[PDB]
Design a protein around this ligand. Structure first.
Ligand SMILES: CNCc1ccc2c(c1)N(C(=O)OC)[C@H](CNC(=N)N)[C@H]2NC(=O)C(=O)Nc1ccc(Cl)c(F)c1
Ligand SMILES: *[C@@H]1O[C@H](CO)[C@@H](O)[C@H](O)[C@H]1NC(C)=O
Ligand SMILES: *[C@@H]1O[C@H](CO)[C@@H](O)[C@H](O)[C@H]1NC(C)=O
Ligand SMILES: *[C@@H]1O[C@H](CO)[C@@H](O)[C@H](O)[C@H]1NC(C)=O
Ligand SMILES: *[C@@H]1O[C@H](CO)[C@@H](O)[C@H](O)[C@H]1NC(C)=O
Ligand SMILES: *[C@@H]1O[C@H](CO)[C@@H](O)[C@H](O)[C@H]1NC(C)=O
Ligand SMILES: *[C@@H]1O[C@H](CO)[C@@H](O)[C@H](O)[C@H]1NC(C)=O
Length: 335
């Protein structure tokens, strides 16, 4: 309803670019945060219509402008060139705070789906620390649901609406370009992936009860959304997930159709230079990869899915606002 401000442990000393941006965009985190439980009250929320999401989106666009400058930016006919140094890039958590006269209501219901009424409600000055992690298909390094896997959607019957799966247990994904210089790969332990998809299939089954639940790779589109794309220490990884979203959940049981090897699914990745931008319609060109071993060890904490008897789910993404919603879903600004 108003304009928020951000708070962070960004440090002076870092040249890591999230730290720099936060040092002159945010105020320091309050060591002593106040929170007010009101477990009787009940109010409504709508994670799909939440202007904290737009405010954070604009912040992260600004952060990426200042921090990950492309050598060339193409928007339509016009090309902007500027220096594109390699930088140290590691997202840090950001808190969104309501200014004087306003508060932030947090919904305390462990299983709240992001929509409708919520009984146990607190009031706080700032959100928890949210790392602004840009990615598609898999949500990385978020915070897990406390109880059961949660299915979030603006409208589950409308198959054009992105589904956000909030995981209650993280799944490790290690992606590495080892010492082709654009060849990389990610390793996921097939045991845990098997489990979490068994559980996601269970919850989806509750919402589509007659049907068989199939997971399948992304149909089509730009590489950014048909692969699991993300930024790892400045470099843009594009990781094939057809061995990942590839399985059937039938009779209360999940069976993985994807191919593994000695207990691990391995995704084949490329580090790319020409990027379809998430900030706006346009292209960005960056310099070739830094040297040595580029490795990110991340937690998968959620999924972005799109629904096509049988119901069929494929990985989605492309609108980074859904990434922010997945963390902001339980907050509302008031007063
Ligand atoms: C939600 N389904 C609709 C949909 C599908 C696809 C997209 C949108 C929307 N976009 C949108 O809403 O912009 C507000 C985008 C429009 N930009 C464009 N065409 N150049 C596009 N997304 C990306 O291009 C994208 O994510 N690139 C990407 C780059 C670097 C990394 Cl590390 C990364 F992880 C991802
Ligand atoms: C979320 O809960 C509301 C009721 O609180 C319900 O109307 C809506 O259909 C639910 N959505 C999902 C995706 O479960
Ligand atoms: C996570 O959610 C699933 C189903 O939503 C449930 O079976 C499981 O017990 C939950 N908690 C875990 C695995 O810790
Ligand atoms: C979502 O589903 C359809 C759109 O396909 C329509 O009835 C309406 O927009 C929504 N329905 C409900 C029950 O929310
Ligand atoms: C992923 O790999 C499979 C098999 O290697 C291939 O058929 C598919 O086209 C790839 N997807 C993308 C988006 O490159
Ligand atoms: C699942 O993986 C197998 C083996 O990698 C592949 O042949 C198949 O095409 C994948 N499934 C789908 C629906 O693409
Ligand atoms: C996720 O967090 C870990 C630990 O901070 C970090 O090493 C990793 O690179 C992060 N992943 C991404 C994609 O930022």
């Amino acid at each position: 309803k108003t304009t928020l401000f951000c708070a962070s442990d960004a440090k002076a000393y870092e040249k890591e670019v999230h730290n720099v941006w936060a040092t002159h965009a945010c105020v320091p985190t309050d060591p002593n945060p106040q929170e007010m439980v009101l477990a009787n009250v009940t109010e409504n929320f709508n994670m799909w219509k939440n202007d904290m999401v737009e405010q954070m989106h604009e912040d992260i666009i600004s952060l990426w402008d200042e921090s990950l400058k492309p050598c060339v930016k193409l928007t339509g006919g016009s090309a902007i060139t500027q220096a594109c140094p390699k930088v140290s890039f590691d997202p840090i958590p950001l808190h969104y705070c309501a200014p004087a006269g306003f508060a932030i209501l947090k919904c305390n219901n462990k299983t709240f789906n992001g929509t409708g009424p919520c009984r146990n409600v607190s009031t706080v000055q700032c959100t928890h620390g949210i790392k602004p992690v840009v990615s598609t298909q898999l949500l990385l390094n978020g915070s897990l649901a406390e109880e059961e896997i949660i299915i979030r959607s603006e409208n589950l019957t409308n198959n054009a609406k992105t589904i956000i799966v909030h995981l209650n247990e993280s799944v490790n994904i290690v992606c590495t370009r080892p010492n082709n210089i654009r060849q990389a790969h990610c390793n996921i332990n097939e045991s845990k992936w098997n489990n979490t998809l068994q559980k996601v299939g269970e919850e989806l089954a509750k919402h589509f009860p007659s049907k068989t639940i199939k997971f399948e790779p992304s149909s089509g589109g730009d590489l950014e959304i048909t692969t699991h794309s993300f930024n790892c220490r400045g470099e843009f990884f594009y990781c094939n997930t057809s061995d990942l979203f590839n399985g059937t959940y039938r009779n209360g049981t999940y069976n993985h159709t994807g191919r593994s090897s000695n207990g691990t699914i391995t995704l084949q990745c490329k580090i790319k230079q020409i990027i379809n931008m998430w900030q706006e319609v346009g292209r960005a060109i960056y310099a070739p990869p830094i040297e040595g071993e580029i490795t990110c060890n991340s937690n998968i904490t959620g999924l972005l899915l799109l629904r096509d008897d049988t119901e069929t789910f494929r990985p989605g993404g492309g609108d980074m606002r859904d990434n922010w919603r997945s963390e902001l879903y339980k907050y509302k600004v008031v007063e």
